Amino acid sequence: EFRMEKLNQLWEKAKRLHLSPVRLAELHSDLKIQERDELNWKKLKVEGLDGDGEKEAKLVHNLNVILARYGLEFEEPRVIDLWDLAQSANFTEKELESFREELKHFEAKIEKHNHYQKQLEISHQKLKHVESIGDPEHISRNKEKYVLLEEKTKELGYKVKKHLQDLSSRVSRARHN
Amino acid sequence: NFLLFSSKTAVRGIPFTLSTQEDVMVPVTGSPSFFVGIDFDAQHSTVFYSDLSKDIIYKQKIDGTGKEVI
Amino acid sequence: EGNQRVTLITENLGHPRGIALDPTVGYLFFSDWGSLSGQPKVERAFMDGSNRKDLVTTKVGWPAGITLDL
Numbered sequence: 116e117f118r119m120e121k122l123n124q125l126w127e128k129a130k131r132l133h134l135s136p137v138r139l140a141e142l143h144s145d146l147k148i149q150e151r152d153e154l155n156w157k158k159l160k161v162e163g164l165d166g167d168g169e170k171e172a173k174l175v176h177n178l179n180v181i182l183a184r185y186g187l188e189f190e191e192p193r194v195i196d197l198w199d200l201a202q203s204a205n206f207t208e209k210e211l212e213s214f215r216e217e218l219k220h221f222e223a224k225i226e227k228h229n230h231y232q233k234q235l236e237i238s239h240q241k242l243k244h245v246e247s248i249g250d251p252e253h254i255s256r257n258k259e260k261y262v263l264l265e266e267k268t269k270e271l272g273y274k275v276k277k278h279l280q281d282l283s284s285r286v287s288r289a290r291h292n
Numbered sequence: 293n294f295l296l297f298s299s300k301t302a303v304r305g306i307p308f309t310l311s312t313q314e315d316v317m318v319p320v321t322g323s324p325s326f327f328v329g330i331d332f333d334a335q336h337s338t339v340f341y342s343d344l345s346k347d348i349i350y351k352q353k354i355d356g357t358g359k360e361v362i
Numbered sequence: 363e364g365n366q367r368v369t370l371i372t373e374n375l376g377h378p379r380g381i382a383l384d385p386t387v388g389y390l391f392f393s394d395w396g397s398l399s400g401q402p403k404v405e406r407a408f409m410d411g412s413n414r415k416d417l418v419t420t421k422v423g424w425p426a427g428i429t430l431d432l
Contacts (some may be wrong), residue, residue, distance in 0.1 A: 313372055314369050314373075314411075315370070315372055349432075356367065
């Protein structure tokens with residue numbers, strides 16, 4: 116890389132120190148520039164074309180400083196699916212925002228439906244215990260609850276299914292057009 | 293930008309987006325007309341077309357005015 | 363006096379024939395004796411063309427005219 120004797124010695128240290136490669140690359144650059152200046156300076160020493168010490172000072176100044184610089188949002192699977200598909204539909208931003216609010220209301224509906232199905236299950240557990248007990252008054256009361264709670268739960272079931280069909284069909288239509 | 297297309301009935305311009313389907317330029321139409329060729333000059337906001345039924349080449353602005361024979 | 367042209371409805375329009383509106387409520391009604399989809403219908407929109415609905419669809423046939431009892 117360098118003709119110069121003592122610049123070859125200095126250049127090895129920077130490899131050993133693993134300095135910043137860009138600064139390391141620039142360190143080669145100015146040393147390759149300096150070696151031309153250094154040989155030029157000495158070329159005057161055999162040519163006797165300097166006696167004022169300029170061509171020594173100018174080069175050692177840079178070298179000495181070089182010694183310093185280098186040391187040298189949804190919850191239900193169905194609404195998530197509908198939102199994911201509706202993202203790729205031909206919806207206007209206004210229709211997209213209205214559709215977002217519609218999925219929020221649909222999500223509230225499905226949460227209500229699953230809450231009442233779980234209530235229909237714990238009322239079924241109470242009904243199983245009562246039927247095993249066999250008390251006619253307990254059976255009559257638990258029926259008055261259960262047989263009407265079933266219809267309330269099922270009416271929500273129909274309404275959630277219809278809303279899901281409408282939303283899914285509208286998204287599928289808005290994906291092809 | 294919009295999608296310029298030509299047919300026998302008319303020359304029309306529709307948005308590239310499939311949501312907002314309404315035309316964005318006045319549909320060019322003639323009585324015996326049969327349109328084939330189209331191009332545009334967006335600096336003057338004009339469209340060139342050829343009525344193959346008349347054998348005439350026209351130019352017309354986007355807003356529907358300024359029909360002239362080329 | 364025929365200024366400020368702008369198109370409201372164009373999608374699916376088939377054969378639009380009848381039209382009526384009630385600016386006091388903001389609905390626009392128009393009839394259509396066969397769409398690009400095939401179905402003839404009477405439909406309702408807002409007066410800006412948005413939020414279209416099949417207002418009548420069964421046994422519609424060839425709806426030719428519309429008026430409103432305001």
